[model samples]
Target: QTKIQKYAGTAMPYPNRTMTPFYINHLGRHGARFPTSRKALDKVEKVLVSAQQENGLTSEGMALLSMIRRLSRLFDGQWGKLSKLGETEQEGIAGRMIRNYPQLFSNSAKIEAIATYVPRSINSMDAFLSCMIRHNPALQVQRSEGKQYNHILRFFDLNKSYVNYKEKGDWLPIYKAFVHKKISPVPIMKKFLLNPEQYLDKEAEEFVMALFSVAAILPDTSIPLNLEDLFTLDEWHRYWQTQNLRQYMSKSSAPVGKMLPVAIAWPLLSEFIRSAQEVISGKSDYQANFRFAHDNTVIPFVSLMGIEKTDVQVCRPDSVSVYWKDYEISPMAANVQWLFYRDRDQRIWVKILLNEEAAALPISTACFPYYSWEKTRIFFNQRIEMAKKTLSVFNE
Candidate 1:
């Protein structure tokens, strides 16, 4: 959802006086984006154009047509690029990180900033790192974006077993059943079309979904073209819940998939742990490591770390919303950050931050948002083994 929110939760807790933050490991999705499918808005335009030319649109339908025209114009040339809102969001996230952890970013702190080869992700990296560097001109960052880092930055794209599971997983049938019951555009189509059946050729499902896609990006555009009326609150929630279920079942830790979907993120998590170990052991000089990718990476990574509602295993499809919501889990500019700290005792402590809000690691912790790094590392290392075992099924 490009309509990203300001940090609205409880104010961040000041660390225990004994502990000082020294390092950050971050994974962020690109901010609000134009629809990935570049031609989607075009299709929407054609659907509405056909209706208007045929004199088939009601006043409501005509309003939608006008709205789509304005929305499409915004995406006219740049269909898959980051929006102004996206830049603002990345800047905001990076600004806060620098301000909160000045020690990690001062004195020309070495930053290894990596991104997936995708342009939006690359730009997000630039936007994020640039903000930090600008705030503290002495901060240093090395940026790289390419497929060479795919094993860790985008393991999902290169994994054979995971790809197979996504396309032909056992969860698909169940998810489809949920979609059938939950997602439909009939009512919305009826609201706009004089003869909804006449335009049935476009498939109300397609029309409604296309319009919803447009509406979802409204905030990103900042053009004030409101498509909010296209979906009622209940309708929007139902539609979002349906999508939430699909991503939950197909990309996250939902038990229906038997962990296969998230197992692919193991390599990425292993890298995070490995990088922290190097920094903790004084083998690496980097003050922070930032990796920018997509929701695909962020969601699965969220699963492995068991962050918030993202890691639950929902037994019923409809109940998915009770445990998980995608916007909350991995919205535009979503981030998963590991903050590393050291106390007066020289014992390293770690805390997880999901979108800047304190989150918990799945294992036992002496204090919330602060777990012993030695114990945290041990817990996550075991988790890596579990994911490796889950992926081992592909070998046999």
Candidate 2:
């Protein structure tokens, strides 16, 4: 209901050009992919088929069921893998980077890129690097994929308490209330059957979730379905609320949320700081350190960075929209880039960009769009200390 911009592209540029992009370190979330499993892909049809056997389906319901079945087959063999759209997304992003920072990559510039063991992340890394090399074939690049780099790319396992809370706790009771009140398959369900109420609460919720999941991931597939008719604007908002709540609690700064986002991301943040320092100190051969990861990794890291009020607490579920916005924090192919700038005098400055747009640093700003490296270091060191304090209670 607010008049704020909702979505942003990944290639957004910095506001000013006072400093050059001498060194870059970037973390990118994997691009879109097909549903992770066959069970997930067939969830919609399974529910619809069950409802149909009970004579609870209308003509429209049968039609919808047929549509879902058709879509399911499209992804049968390709489950959990990056879609063609995902590949194109990564390639487009790489092309944009090449265009945006022409000065950053030289024929001999050293590039270091790593990805998690997930096929999607590895594919995303390959797509990006391939595009980069296509633009400049002489670039020297180092690649790391698989479990060897899981320590940095998948840091959630480093702390167990965070994982337990995420998997076990309701954490936000308000979220359930909102889901119950705002999301109902009645409108869509009634269109197919007269006695839609015969469907249990769990069944109805599951159906709606399945539908929303399809809508969320459908665009990435080669098949196109007009899902707009399935849910109204209000219903979509409610569906988004549930998805956003999950992301927020797991990745944002809620009471149960704070420790995990900060903890999972601290090691990587440390790596970023170290890498930036190396580039600034003239001791590093690599011009950029690139990482490909999932939204789980990217969102927590961005929340830790304090992008778009991610550090704020939302006392009520309804207050979430007022504080944390999802499309801004972790969209498909979302990224956080720390472009390090240096001058002839050896002074270092850094500009932080979230999803390619100029993002404010959590620390005090010495200049617009650029901050002294010393201040930037102090802010993050303080964050790590605070995170340590939060994590210490777990040990006790």
Candidate 3:
């Protein structure tokens, strides 16, 4: 069975050739990395090791264990760090940006890049910037770092209400219930165990967590193993479904999920709009602004922007898969680029590129793929006003 592929943003072409790209403002998630915490990886290794020692493994279990061993060796001392593939991912995105808008990166163009102080974010910014510098050797890019930059780039972390929700909030129960319904360790345990009936439910749960941790990061793993061969196609689909549920509730468009971005991403969205205004009024010094952050920030920002496939809230449990798709929203290296274009008439238009591909903005417009800045600005301002009212309810 083919493993369920992970979510990556799509590639669509620009809709207009008459307008030239004059400025670019981008917000991107860091490139893929190994598991962020040690607990998940260590738990999986411990479970596999214990099973082997107990002689409770089937042939497939043994093969699975061998793969685990190889992964352990390959990831040693590299856990939570960006893999070599991550560097390549960022560079590839930079290369595409250069190809798509070479005019924006000319020797005379000014670039301002910033990222959260987190090492992975910093590294991703480095990889992304190096490519721009390489393509235009005469370009001088300014770098901004540290906590002072967190307000706009890492608002989710600094916001008190958001931090509280992440630590302990009403959303926890919903997340756990979704995980329970979509993933079952019993079947997986039975597949690999000679005496599956002997294990307690708690043991099975732990094993499942370990399994998912490995599966979630398999795409980013440096080891050479056929990840699909390790699980039946149905199992892979179920596993990805569980992940999608979490992403939906946490960042995308679950019942509670839809509200999260309005709280955490409003300020960031305002900043983007403000920057555009600055450029329009000739108050800004830089021609372009680039930012790097985590999926939590990128996903919510899009949700706030009302991007398609992201604004629909999940109303039914069984209907979630229909509404919330992982690959469409939050993938490794996911990004949203707002290209400021100017027509021959001195009218400025805005086009948004989701994952480096052209996509329609969520607001209503007479034209598609490209909208007048005057019109788009009004749309976003209204969204911000509506968001404030919605946020007041959340705060209460």
Candidate 4:
């Protein structure tokens, strides 16, 4: 009988999963609700009240801010699953791209421009991918397929012009002809692939083709390639039946397997058509302001809950919030603007402004030649002097 007490000192995690009232009592000392509510909303409210006390703000200031973020996630579509009020205006090719990949779209053309005002020195492909991850959190690239591999291609195309200006250093053909531009769907698709284990069986043919299809979007050549370059249309059916590629396809008179190509191609073809139209038409009447307004108009306060199909009229947060809290937003000439940021202690901080200020100021490009003519050409010298003057005096 005494030997049966060997496990007497054993401890176990909470059996009922109930919050201890004693623990709740301790929390109450900080003016927090005891045990707290199991509900996310209730927990958020409690945290807000406590945060306000700790931050030394006016009563419930933290609560108001917390409410804003929480409400934005719920009514405003924080995940962007729904369009809601108070969202940024979107337009152009960038806007259309966001429907499939939201991260790069959020930063838009700024992310695409390697030599633009948004600095952070992206001289390499990896740097561009890293920047994309940093600037656009919503576009998850951690996965091997879809988001991640596609971005790898984007990163390749972005800085491809710089390091290897000539085709000697090019990686475009490896991707362009094989990935985005390829025809006959999965022709020659299964030879090389990195398996997304969770996405499909380790060697699943359908999965391999799908992965490559996404990967092909990595190169800039993907977009510019002619139809013939995209696919070997004449021999594509043969390519599909090749020994290596056929392993992924089911030539067997099996049920449901025949539909794999149809399954993949149907949606992709439709999307390609839409994307092509969007890109081709972007040059026509491209009003940046109108595009921004159109994008902002559809985003609503409740689009975050994956309710994209629902139609609910909601107001944008322009009237309710300040975009300049981190930085002062000031309008500039020629539709350009600037943002000025300050630290918590009221220190003058960094600024994000149009890079072409000197070029824009005096507001004439003829006054600023595209390239210097000679060492002392009047227009060129004047432009250089103006640029230097602005850098020294106005940039600060």
Candidate 5:
């Protein structure tokens, strides 16, 4: 499956003449970054160079090594940092958002920007905020990046139960089986090594996985490196499937997750509602709030919102790939946006957007995208209420 790469996004229908949007809450993942660590890159490069030294590589292998050399100039010394392409993604997303709701950005508009305590996310906010300020020079914006937003933006790290389960979760066996039995590394190994079996003792899966990680990130960079030619469609699909299963188990409405993933996003949901109430009652002047975090935040927040495809809850691990695809659900630079509008009668109508495409909440409204904020707010607050009950699992 082709991952969402750039930011020319979906266009929304014209708002009803009587209503105008005034507030937006954006939950955004950091744009693409260098790998969080150099282990994968190092391992892959180390082995490839070794093979090259021995003249063990085939023509395809040499091509792959050369590609890695080009990539290393950008990624080698830059682990965990945002890439050049990430800056453009942030600016593009901001440009689209500002254009989509022109009423929300003005010289006097006030906005709050928060991100997890990471450079990738902080830089993402910088690019987005700079874009908005460039569009409206007088816009007032405040930015923060720290643990203050951790409970909402990095809930998985804060929750001991979730952290423990993630490492020792029941899904491990299923994923291991998928990788160990279903994903044959021989195809990838043979492509690179003349005697592919020479590396079997190395748990050759590591090499395949390293290559896949590098392949997956290539789309986020300016480099025209394409690894698709190296792996069969089935080989890449299986890699995608394994990752899909990991994401489903770690951050979704899947049965094995026991609502923990959904429940943990309540703090974010609560923050959104609380701020909306402030904006509605004229208690706050902020026109928009942007939160930058990780894929971890966007997936569960959307699940808690009960968005159309985010509500899938089938229990079978094997069935996860059939229903869930990680790249589509939370790719690089993913976002969930809430647009709040006010009709002339003082009724607040809310519109939800997933990755810049207009979306709907589970709450029913004949108005489609322009849902009553009262109904939508109540719907998510009830979700917070239920999440609290589900979180009682930690009491033990």
Candidate 6:
């Protein structure tokens, strides 16, 4: 809590197929295994055509077309398939395609190839895996309640109901085999019943933990952990305090404060602004008055321009401006001001109103005593009119 005024948006975006911020975490910077550059897409297209032509198919181009098609169908599980209606109810049809046709899409081998190219991308894979570990029931409930993993899952659960974990893994064969090995109808039903999409909370609970756990054990040269890893408290704080940690955030935070005077303020505040901006601009709707906080409070003179929250990084080059209300309040007052932190010893105080309310505060500030009285009044009145237009769609 830096003690200015603080409020954030409802929640960060849930990931999807689209090119949003939430989906692009550490992708380019760390090295994307499957980079989305136009050139890369072109290259993939060429590869697809080669694969398709080699098979002597009419509507094929890519080498991994079958695999891609399988993955696309497998994405939504049964619900995804059923939602299409008229689609065949074939079981593991996609998985079998990949398995049966190993020359093009060998599971473990392809994963290793991806890892070789984008080591950082592995974590992206892990992020996906983490989604599952946090959901699987048999895995999640085993943990202690106060654990950071638990807290993250709780937040993740409330924020997004669905999570897609790593696409490729050994688990599929095991699951399919398990189903075949079991003869009882009750167990067979139980196996199908444990679908991750239906109850991902527990599956992701275990899956996500295993991902980071492996990262901690094995060293990845091309992609190592970065600030994004700090989404969890243990990873963040430990990374924050440790020296030898490889990630940028922790390595950046480790130096002695006084020795490097700039360290006292720059890193933390900069991340707040950067993260806030990224979250704001990436969204399609909702004008967010954004700020980042430790124990739920804002830092003064330091706020990101409002924007969408679609992207993964919390900052952007272009953003819309908003009038910032700067003030200092006791930690006690700060707690009462926002929902995130209530009794933390050190807290930042942020009071956020809608864009209209924000613009109105300075309207009369110049009336009798405040500076630039007339200009402030005119500016606020115009802002209020704009705000009304923007908010009108919400009126029921």
Highest TM-score model number: 2
- lDDT of every predicted structure (CA atoms): 0.76, 0.74, 0.74, 0.22, 0.78, 0.22
Across 17-44, the per-residue lDDT of candidate 2 in tens digits comes to 1245888899998876776766554777
Between candidates 5 and 6, which one is better according to TM-score? Answer: 5
TM-scores of the candidates in the order shown: 0.90, 0.91, 0.91, 0.17, 0.90, 0.17
TM-score of 4: 0.17
Compared with the true structure, what per-residue lDDT tens digits does model 3 show for residues 1-396? 112455212111111122458888899888877766667667766876788899888887787778777777777787667667778888888887888778777767888889988888888899999998889987878997768878878877776766776677666787677667766777787767778768786777778767766766766755555455456667767766766766666665567644765557878889999988898888986778999888888877887787777767868756777776657666777889998988889989999888777776666767678888888888777777777776676673
311 in model 5: Cα distance from truth in Å? 2.7
Better candidate by TM-score, 4 or 5: 5
CA error at residue 345 for candidate 5, angstroms: 2.1
**Model 4, 22-87: lDDT tens per residue?**
000000000000111123333334433444555533333343445334433432222212121111
Q: Write the per-residue lDDT of candidate 6 for residues 99-136, one digit (tens) a residue.
A: 33333222121111011122232333333223323333
> How many steric clashes does model 4 contain?
20
Deviation in Å, model 6, residue 33 alpha carbon: 20
* Model 5 weakest lDDT span, ten residues long: 6-15
Clashing pairs in 3: 7-327
Candidate 1 residue spans exceeding 4 A from truth? 1-19, 197-202
lDDT: worst 10-residue window of model 3: 8-17
Off by over 4 Å in 3: 1-3, 7-18
The global Cα lDDT (0 to 1) of model 4 is 0.22
Kindly list the per-residue Cα lDDT of model 5 for residues 270-335, writing each as its tens digit.
Answer: 999988889888898899999999888988888888888676897777787777666555767888
Per-residue lDDT for 9-90 in model 1, tens only?
0111111111458899999888877666645566677877888898878898787778777766666777678877788788
Better of 1 and 6 by TM-score: 1
**lDDT for position 80 in model 6:** 10
Ten-residue stretch with the least lDDT total in model 6: 19-28
